[PDB]
Amino acid sequence: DFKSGLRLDGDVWVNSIRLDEYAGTVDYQNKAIVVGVPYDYDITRMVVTEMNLSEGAKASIAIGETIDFSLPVSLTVKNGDVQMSYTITVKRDE
C-alpha cells in the first residue's frame, strides 16, 4: 500500500575480477580495485576475462572485451534499481 516497488534490495557487491591473468584486490571502504603488473606488462590492452559481482547484478564492463587501463576506470554495477560505483586502477610495480 506504501511500497513503491523499486526493488531496493539490489546486491551490488563485487566479489573478484581478473584482468587477463592478474587478480585484483578490492577495497569496499573507498570502492577501489587495485591490480598490479610486474613492471613490464603492457597496460593498454587488457581483456576482461572473468568477473562475478552478485545475483542479478549488471555492470557496464562486459566479458571478453579489451580495455586500456592507463588511467583509473569508473565501473558502475547495477542491481534491480540501485547502482554502485567503483574505481579500477592498475599500477606498474616499482
Binding site: 572485451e65 579489451t66 586500456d68 592507463s70 588511467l71 576506470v73 569508473s74 574505481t87 586502477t89
Partner: protein, 497 residues
Amino acid sequence: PILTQKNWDGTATYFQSSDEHGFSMYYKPQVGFVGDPMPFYDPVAKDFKVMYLQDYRPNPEATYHPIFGVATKDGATYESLGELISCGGRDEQDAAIGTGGTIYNPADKLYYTFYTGNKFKPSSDQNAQVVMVATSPDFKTWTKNRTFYLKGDTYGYDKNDFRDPFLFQTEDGVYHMLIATRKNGKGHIAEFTSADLKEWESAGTFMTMMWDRFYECPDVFKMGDWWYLIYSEQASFMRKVQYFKGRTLEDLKATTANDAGIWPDNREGMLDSRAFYAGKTASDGTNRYIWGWCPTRAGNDNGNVGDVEPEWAGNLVAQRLIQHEDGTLTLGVPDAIDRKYTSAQEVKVMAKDGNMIESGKTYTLGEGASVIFNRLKVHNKISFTVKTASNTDRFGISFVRGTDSASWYSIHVNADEGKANFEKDGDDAKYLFDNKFNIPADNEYRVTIYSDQSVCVTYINDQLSFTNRIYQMQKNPWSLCCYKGEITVSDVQVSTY
C-alpha cells in the same frame, strides 16, 4: 479570481521583461545551456541530427560536459533526443568532452562519433586531451570504444593542445580527420587518413596557422566550385568566426601556407560578431546551414559584454550560408525560420522628439531624429527598407527603448566606416563591439531583424549578419534614429507568431 489585462499596445513605458527557460526558434533546453554545436546530416532519416554540449552554471568540479542531441528537419523546429555520450569519471581521460565530429559508415551501417576527452588536473606525463570514439547502431544508444586512444604526443604534437577532431569523407572513399593542434609552439591543422575509422595514419601537416593564433572547430567542405574552411578564433581579442576560400583542396592547403594571409575577401573573412562562436556547417544536399552558440551575459545585463572573452555556452543559433558568384560567403536567415512568422502586427508612432516628418508609411529622418514604434513580442520579425542620402551616413536601430528608458541598446550602421556597431546608448554611451561588411553602392538597405525572446539576428541587404543578446527586448518599443546623415524608411512590417 479575475485576471487583469494591461494595454501593452498604446503605452511606450519601459517594462521589465523576463525570459523563459526554454526557447522555440533558437533552441535551448529548459535545463542548462548549449555549447559548441556538432552539426550532422543523417543519410537514413534525411534530416539534421545536431549534437551539442550541455553546460550548467554550477558545473561539477571534475567532470562537467554532458552531451545531448538535437534532431530537426529544418532550422526552425527542434526536438531533443536526450543524453547521448555520458560524462566520464573523475580519474578518466574523458571527464571533460570537447568539440568533435560524426560520420555514418554505411559499410557496417554504424554512426561513429569522435570527441576530445580532457583529463581533470592532468599530470605532466599524462596527455591533457585525447581523441576518443563512440559507436551507435541507430543514433540512440552509444558505446565508447575503450580500445581507441589517440595521443597527440605520439606524432610529435602538443599534449595539452589537441582539440576538435573534424571527420569528413572525400570522393575516393577514404576518411580524413582534422585536428587543430600545436606543433613546436606553432598552430597546425593536422590530417589523419583512414579507410575503416580504426587505423589512422598521420598524413603530415594539413595546414599551418596565422600569426601563431588558435582556431576552434575547423570544418572543411565544398560548395559547388570552391573549397571552404570555416573556423572560430580562440584569440581573446578576436573571438569570432573566420573562413578561407579555395578553388581546390590543394589550392586551399597552399593558401596561407606560411603567413601568406590570402584573405577570402576585403572583410578578412568575417561572418559575425563576438555573439556567434563555434560556427560549424552541414549540408542536406541542396542547402548549407551553420550552427553556433550565442553567449549569454553575466547578470543578464546587455551592457556587460564581458572582459577579455564572453561567457561560455548560450543559445543555439542556426543560419543559412549564401554563396555568391565571386566565392564570397554570407550568412542568411533560414527559409523555415522566415516562413514561420505568419501573423502581422500594425505599427504606429508613439514618440516624436526630433525633426522627422511622416508621409503615410514612409518616414524621413534627419540629424538627431528618432522615431519610436510600438512594443514587440516574444517572437518578432521587423522588415523595412532604408534609403540613405549618401554613402557616409550613421543611422541605427535601438532596442529596449521607451519614453522613460534611461538607456537603450543600439546598432548603428555607419557607412563612413563601412560597418555596424553594437553600443549601449542613453546614460552610459558605451561602445560594445562591431562587425564589418560591404556598403552597397545604391545607398539602399533591406533591414530584417528576427528576434526570438532575447536573441536577435539582423540581416542587412543579404550581406551583413549581426547577432546580439538583448535582454528585456520583448514587449518593449523599438526606435529608429539617425545622427549624421539623412534617411528614408519605408515598408515597415512587424510579424509575430
